[PDB]
Structures are given as C-alpha cells and as structure tokens.
C-alpha cells in the first residue's frame, strides 16, 4: 500500500562494485522484509536474499552467499503508522551473465509462514555489465507521415539512434503530450549499440496551435536533448489535407 | 515472555492476544489536593463498570475472550484472517473500525437478548 | 537575528520537564473477526 | 468456517488521547523533611520503590509539548498550592500605616 | 532450474486453463508452500497466490490455487485479454527462500485478429549531412505476436543490413516490433525506392518510400 | 497511562520512535524562575 | 419494537420481559454544588453492586434471566401462569409480593449455597 523507487541505471566494468538503492514511503519500514530478485536473459528469474530492518537478520542464497552484502538504513518516522526508510544491496565481482534487471520488494506479512514473501515491488534498475564505454544518443526528428487521409490524422516522432547502454526515456513537451505516443524497443546492432524510435499520433489541424518538442534523457552520459519536430511533413498522402 | 503492561501495542493482534491478561490486570489496580485523587479514583472505577457492563450484557460475562453469533459485515474493512491477525496492530485496527464500533455494539447486546429468552423456553 | 531573555508566563517552566510526557486512556474493548461461533 | 463472526477482546493494547485528573507522588524521605508540611506533601501518596518502566517496542506515537495538558494541570495546581498555604497565615491588614 | 512448470498452455476466453509446477521432492511439495506471480516482461510482477490456495490482497476471485504432494496448479477462470503473459511459481517455507520455476507463457486463444499498422520513415536531412541513412520500419497493433520483416532494394531482395526487433506486447493487449535497415548515402541516391515487407499469417503487408520523390 | 519518549533528539513535537510507558513521571521540582531555567533535567548529547 | 427505558411498565410481565435489556442498559449509565453530583453518582453504583451481589450469590451471575431450584409457595398470591404473564404488570405484581420479597430472597441464596458444596463433591 506504498511505493518503492530505485537508483538510476548505471554501467559498471566487470570486477568492480555497484551499489543500488531502494527508498520506501507509505508504510512502516521496520515491519516488513526487503527481498532482492534479479532477472538476466540467460538464467531466468533468481532470488538473492532478504533482510529484516528491525532485527538486521539476513538470509542469503548459496550462489550469492559470497559476493553480496545487504545494508539497511535506520527508520525516519513521518506519521503514527507510516514512515520512510532505505535499503541498499552491493554485489561484488560482476560478470557478463550478471546483465539484467534488479528489483527490491517489500515483504507480505509481519507474522506467519509467508512473512518474507515479496508482495510490493519497485521499478527496477537495469544493470549492464560490459567492457564497452558509455555512448550518448543521436536524436533525429522523424518527418511526419500520412496515417489517414479521410480521418485527418498523422504521426511524427524522434529517432534515437546509436546509444549505450540501456535505457533511454523519451518524453514530449516536458510531460504534457502523453496520448497517442508509441515508443518502440531498441535493436541490438552488430556493433553493440541500441537504437529505439519514438512516434506520436496527432491530427493534421494542429500546426500553429501547439509546439512539438521531444525530450530524450540519457542519464549515463549526463546529456539531455530537446528536438523540435517540424509540423511540415513530406508525405504526399497527407499534403492533401493541408 | 511477560513484556508488561501494554507490552504488545506494536505486536500483531494475534501476537497481542497473548498479553490480554497483562493489560487487564493493571486496569483497576487495587482538605484539598487530597480530593484530586478521590474524584480521579472514582473516575477509575466507573470506567471499569462501564466496560464490565458491556461484557455482561454481551455473551461474555467471563472475561478476556468470548464469541458472539453476530455475522461480521464485509463493509467493516474487508480484510482476511491472515491480513488482520498476522499483519495489523490493535491500535491500527480500531482506527478503521472506529466508525463502526457503535453500530456493532448494538447487535451484540441484542443478539444476546434473543438468546436468553429462547433459553428460557428450552428449560 | 538577535535574541533577548524572557518569561512572565509561568507555564513555560513546566514544559521544560514535561516535554517527554503525554496522557492517554486505555480502551480495552476491541472487536475483531474470527471463524468462531457459539 | 468461511463466514466470519465478531469476537470481543477485553484487555487489548488500545488507547486514545484524553485528559484526566492527575495526582501526586513524592518518595518517603520527603515526608521526613516535615517542618510543618513544606510546600505540598501532606496526605499525598508516597512513591513505591518499584519504578516500573516498560519499553513499547515498534510503537511510534506523536507527542506535542506545546499542547500538553500536564502543563495546565501543573501550573494551576502550583497556583492553588500557593493559596492553600496562605489561608491560615497571619494577615497584615493593619500594616498599611 | 530445479522447479519445472508447463512449457506452454492455451485457453479460450470465458473458460478456464491450468498450469503445472512440479519437480523433485527437495523443492516440492511436501512441507513446501507455493506462490504465483503475474509477470509481464519489462514491467513489475503482481502477487496472485501465496500459501498454496490463498489469494493476495485485492486479487480478483478469478484465480485459485491447488497443491498436491507432487505438483501445484493454478486455474484462471474467466480469461481476460490482459492475462496473455508469463507466470512463475516459487517453492518457499517460513525459513528458507524462493526457488523459482522455468515460466509458463500463457496464450489466450479465441481472440480477434489485428492487422498491423506499419509506417516507414526515410532518413532525415540531418543524417544525410553526417552522412548516413537509416530506414525505420515500425509495426504496431498486431495479434498474435509473430511477423516477419523482409527488405527489398528496388524490387530485389536484400540480405545485408537487415535487423528487426522481437514482437513486444503493448498496454492495449496487442503486440509491437520494429525493423531497421542500414544503407549508405549512395545506395540511397542510386536506387529508385526502398520497401519494408511485414508478413503476418500469410498476409504480407508492405510500405515503400521514394528517394526520387 | 502516561507515555515517556526515550530518544536523545526530540523537539517535543512529532512522532517518537522509542516510546516507553510509565505510571508516574520523574521528580519534577517546581522551580519558579524566569530567564534562567534552574535545577532542570539535562538534555542528551547535543543541547536542545 | 424498542419502546425505550421502562417502555413496558404497563405492558404485561410477559410483554415486559422482552424489554429486560432496555431497562438494564440505562441502569448504570457510563468547591460545592460539584459535590451534589459526586455523593449522588456514588449512590448510583452502590445501588448497582447491591443488586449485582444478589444476582451473584443466587444461581444467576450471568444476567437478565435465571432459574432457581426453589419451589414457589402457594400463599404468595396463588395466581396461574396465564393470570400472571398475560394479565398483570411488574408494578402491579411486586405490590402483592412486597410482603414476601424478603422471605423469598433468603431461600435463593441458601438453596444455592447447598448446590455449590454438592458441586465440589462431584468433581
Ligand atoms: C516488532 O516488529 C518486528 C517486525 O515488524 C517483529 O519481528 C517479526 O517477528 C515475527 C514473529 O512474531 C517474525 O515472523 C517469524 O520469523 C521467524 C524467524 O525466521 C527464522 O529464520 C531465520 C533464517 O534462517 C535461515 O538463515 C540462517 C542464516 O542467517 C540459517 O541459520 C538458517 O538455518 C536458515 O538457513 C537455511 O536455509 C538456507 C536456504 O535458504 C541455507 O542457505 C542455510 O544454510 C540453511 O540451510 C533465522 O536466522 C532466524 O533466527 C532469528 O531468530 C532467533 C529467535 O528465534 C534469534 O535468536 C536469532 O538471533 C535471529 O534473530 C529465525 O529463527 C520464522 O521462523 C517464523 O515462522 C515460524 O513461526 C510462525 C509463527 O510465528 C509459524 O506459523 C511458522 O510455521 C514457523 O514455525 C516454525 O518456527 C517456529 C519458531 O521456532 C517453530 O516453533 C515451529 O515449530 C516451526 O519450526 C518447525 O516447523 C517448520 C515447518 O516447515 C520446519 O521447517 C522447521 O525446521 C521446524 O521443524 C515467522 O515467519 C518476523 O520475521 C519478524 N520480522 C519482520 C516481520 O520483519 C517483532 O517481533 C516485533 N516485536 C514486538 C514486541 O512486537
Ligand atoms: C547539578 O548538575 C550536576 C551535574 O554535574 C548534578 O550532579 C549529577 O547528578 C546526577 C543525578 O542527579 C548524577 O547521576 C551525576 O553523577 C551527578 N554528577 C556528578 C559529577 O556527580 C547535580 O545533581 C545537579 N543539581 C541539581 C539539579 O540540583
Ligand atoms: C452491511 O453494511 C451495509 C453498508 O455498507 C449495509 O447496507 C448492510 O445492511 C449491512 N448488513 C446487514 C446485514 O445489515
Ligand atoms: C470514518 O468515517 C469518516 C467520516 O465519518 C471518514 O472520513 C473516514 O475515512 C472513515 N474511516 C475509515 C477508516 O474509512
Ligand atoms: C482469505 O484467506 C483464505 C484462507 O483459507 C483464502 O482461502 C481466501 O482465498 C482469502 N481471500 C482473499 C480475498 O484473499
Ligand atoms: C408456605 O407458606 C405458609 C404460610 O402461608 C407456611 O406455613 C409454609 O411453611 C410455607 N411453605 C414452606 C415449604 O415453607
Ligand atoms: C401485606 O401485608 C400487609 C400487612 O403487613 C397487609 O395489610 C397487606 O394486605 C398485604 N398485602 C397483600 C397484597 O396481601
């Protein structure tokens, strides 16, 4: 009945360390356990361990018995029933097969046999373990095209090409234009660089009544790009409507 | 594990119910300024006979725990057995059921008033 | 910012010893469901 | 079985904020101080040598020192401690000469 | 993994369907409880069932659990279109941890077809000054999720620079994918047009842009 | 009952993490003073 | 039909016995002139523990209704079952049995004192 948030997606070279966080709000942090579960594409979903803030007890899996440390900050009260806290995990000696998504999960109960069962979940911090360096994206504005002549509709967007590593979050008008947007999954090129595409469906009557700006945020490179998609299209099936 | 008076206030309702006899043992406890205590130790026993009279006119009389033939309505915060007795505290619970406490108190004393008259028939 | 000494109201002197105390009433009658019936 | 029935529990850890008439306690060597009842302690109740204290784990309750009624009951008690100690004392009405 | 589920299972709308979850006795099921999670790929899962047969808070009563001494099952009566995803089980106790399973991709049969909505984009003018060229072929709103994308350079098949992404499920209970073609700034000004075929259930769909126009 | 907050840093207002319960408060000498607080409880760690 | 406190004072003893829980719910109810109420709300609970102690030392304890193994003497106004419970009120009745109330009160507390000692034998 709360909310869990995780740190930004970071990139680490193998052999090094990484410390991913998980802060909580909307319940009592010391009454529930915090599991950690990871999912790579070569090993399926895999539980790692849990930890109890009130007691500090930990239980670790034999595979992660010897390379993960779990740590929990102290409880900061907010109300008589709700609080605010924090949970870290630190995995040493990274490997290629460690590339995947990592989650944090509030427990289910306080007493019983299903106490530590992961009930509430976070959002996930994708961990990429590669020797390659980080690359910034190249955002190209997609020229609008004709989707319906009789319906008076269309579709423009932005082309995020060549970036590393995942992910890339694309917004529009600082979070104002949210309907009709379709963001497609990236592709893994033979060079190892991803590249996704974003396109939003808008009517043909909207020209000098609204400003179109796509916001590509790529936090690993510390670069944000804001492109102005031109509402003048080139499709010959849509030029009949203007 | 005698935690003490109100020792299980953050413990689950299931966990706290083992202390029910530890909270009720210390519930009664055995010129001016000397009347500060008289008018207050009088208010300490009317608080007792107000609670005990509810326990009397229900199907309880005998103390601590006691069932009733009142079906629990789903609109009184529909939790489950493992969501109440293993994941909630008595303070947290009486917060959701503070609206319905007065509604419920009536049924117990009326469902019991039907049982006693029926008891006199079958004697 | 400047600060100067004060008092007058004598209800402040007690608070410096009663900051960590408060008063509640014990309500021992709580109802809760379980699968019992008489 | 699957249908649930109400049950009464007497002696639960359930409290709400309220105010009641508070009284005094003051050791027993303080009563040996005597000297014709110094300050307040007379028929006041002596403190038992048991000082009971119970840590309520997991509990978190919101205090408020600036809205606390033990103040208003302590101030007005000390106010009336004053006057009760002056009622049977010598009155200086003829000392305005 | 040491805990095995059914590889796949099908079911029609308005009906029921069952999933298996078994393995050796070291993990299941004597003196071992079972859980069930609805886990869409890319998103975060949702607890459906815990302690063998008990639903989670708020879970609709359309799920139910049943465990034996050798296997445990889950029946999703009244199937919804948003149920076509992956489901995992776990074998835990009060003390130890979770031993997950292999996964059951449930395909909900008896649904309506969806024709793909494809839109091909030519390389931008800023990319022709770099100079490069990338054809962006986006497929949207098709069911089931299995299309094939073939490229052609002036009505002749292409085998170089072709790449198409996996069919991914959207939030409107349809699937989506994307295909890209990497070409040089010379093959862009030498051929008369480029195309993007999207075969789907025998019915091939195709869109063509023209550098000459 | 009367609740005694038992942490070292509390500005007397808000939630208290380590709450304990007591029957009678500590010895509170009614010192009628102004400006300078006299013979009072000492604070813990940092001055409050 | 919740007629209210003493709502069935003119109703027959049979008719009034459905209200027994409505007369006993409001039987306990939860500087000078401020002592007018103190010396009177003290007299309000001694009146309660005087009645409850009779209910305790009889075979009742638990409230409202309760039988006894005392045979009813014919000289205590020999009416019939349909002459009392269908044609008389509690006020009208305790007028004929006001002479014998003290006589009867003894047997209940003595017939019960024989039952408990016999109960300790058979345990
Ligand atoms: C304030 O708030 C707090 C939070 O809100 C609150 O805390 C919560 O309290 C509740 C209780 O009220 C807790 O709920 C219980 O938790 C118990 C503790 O769990 C035990 O397990 C861990 C982990 O053990 C693994 O890891 C360690 C390594 O660290 C190994 O040593 C172990 O062997 C084991 O590892 C194995 O497996 C791994 C593979 O995964 C391998 O890698 C490894 O090599 C091993 O093979 C222990 O470490 C714990 O120890 C701690 O506790 C002891 C005190 O007991 C301390 O001394 C110690 O220092 C640690 O702090 C701990 O022992 C659960 O056991 C418990 O579940 C039982 O109880 C419920 C009812 O309570 C039953 O319904 C349930 O069936 C369970 O019953 C079993 O256990 C009881 C108790 O012993 C037995 O009596 C019973 O018979 C049964 O045991 C038998 O049956 C089993 C049938 O399957 C069988 O399997 C058994 O083997 C046996 O035969 C319940 O979940 C909750 O977790 C707290 N924390 C929260 C909510 O965050 C606090 O109380 C509040 N306070 C107040 C005052 O309100
Ligand atoms: C004045 O302050 C001193 C602090 O040094 C108090 O002396 C301490 O009293 C406490 C208990 O009252 C003891 O635990 C300490 O050991 C004492 N300190 C030393 C150095 O012995 C003294 O009691 C205070 N006087 C008052 C408040 O009247
Ligand atoms: C249960 O509560 C609802 C209100 O949410 C009410 O309408 C209904 O009558 C209640 N049940 C009974 C048996 O009175
Ligand atoms: C109790 O009722 C009040 C209004 O009377 C409402 O604001 C509150 O939400 C209710 N409490 C719960 C727990 O539903
Ligand atoms: C409540 O718990 C019981 C336990 O037997 C379970 O069968 C039932 O499905 C649960 N109900 C809900 C709504 O979770
Ligand atoms: C019944 O009452 C008469 C007086 O009218 C008395 O003599 C008699 O002894 C009583 N019965 C018993 C059993 O005492
Ligand atoms: C009760 O006794 C008195 C005398 O003590 C007598 O006058 C009266 O008639 C008696 N009452 C009844 C109802 O017989």
mmCIF file of C-alpha atoms and ligand atoms in Angstrom, chain G residues 71-76 100 103 107, ligand 6:
data_model
loop_
_atom_site.group_PDB
_atom_site.id
_atom_site.type_symbol
_atom_site.label_atom_id
_atom_site.label_comp_id
_atom_site.label_asym_id
_atom_site.label_seq_id
_atom_site.Cartn_x
_atom_site.Cartn_y
_atom_site.Cartn_z
ATOM 1 C CA UNK G 71 -40.413 -24.260 44.777
ATOM 2 C CA UNK G 72 -42.898 -21.382 44.686
ATOM 3 C CA UNK G 73 -45.219 -21.348 47.708
ATOM 4 C CA UNK G 74 -48.949 -21.123 47.052
ATOM 5 C CA UNK G 75 -49.523 -18.499 49.777
ATOM 6 C CA UNK G 76 -47.548 -15.924 47.741
ATOM 7 C CA UNK G 100 -42.840 -11.855 50.741
ATOM 8 C CA UNK G 103 -38.792 -14.144 52.815
ATOM 9 C CA UNK G 107 -34.099 -19.248 50.000
HETATM 10 C C1 LIG H 6 -45.744 -21.629 52.643
HETATM 11 O O1 LIG H 6 -46.388 -20.552 53.353
HETATM 12 C C2 LIG H 6 -47.064 -20.943 54.558
HETATM 13 C C3 LIG H 6 -47.712 -19.696 55.114
HETATM 14 O O2 LIG H 6 -48.872 -19.334 54.378
HETATM 15 C C4 LIG H 6 -46.069 -21.575 55.527
HETATM 16 O O3 LIG H 6 -46.754 -22.008 56.696
HETATM 17 C C5 LIG H 6 -45.368 -22.750 54.859
HETATM 18 O O4 LIG H 6 -44.382 -23.289 55.734
HETATM 19 C C6 LIG H 6 -44.712 -22.303 53.553
HETATM 20 N N1 LIG H 6 -44.080 -23.430 52.884
HETATM 21 C C7 LIG H 6 -42.834 -23.839 53.154
HETATM 22 C C8 LIG H 6 -42.345 -25.016 52.368
HETATM 23 O O5 LIG H 6 -42.135 -23.283 53.997
#
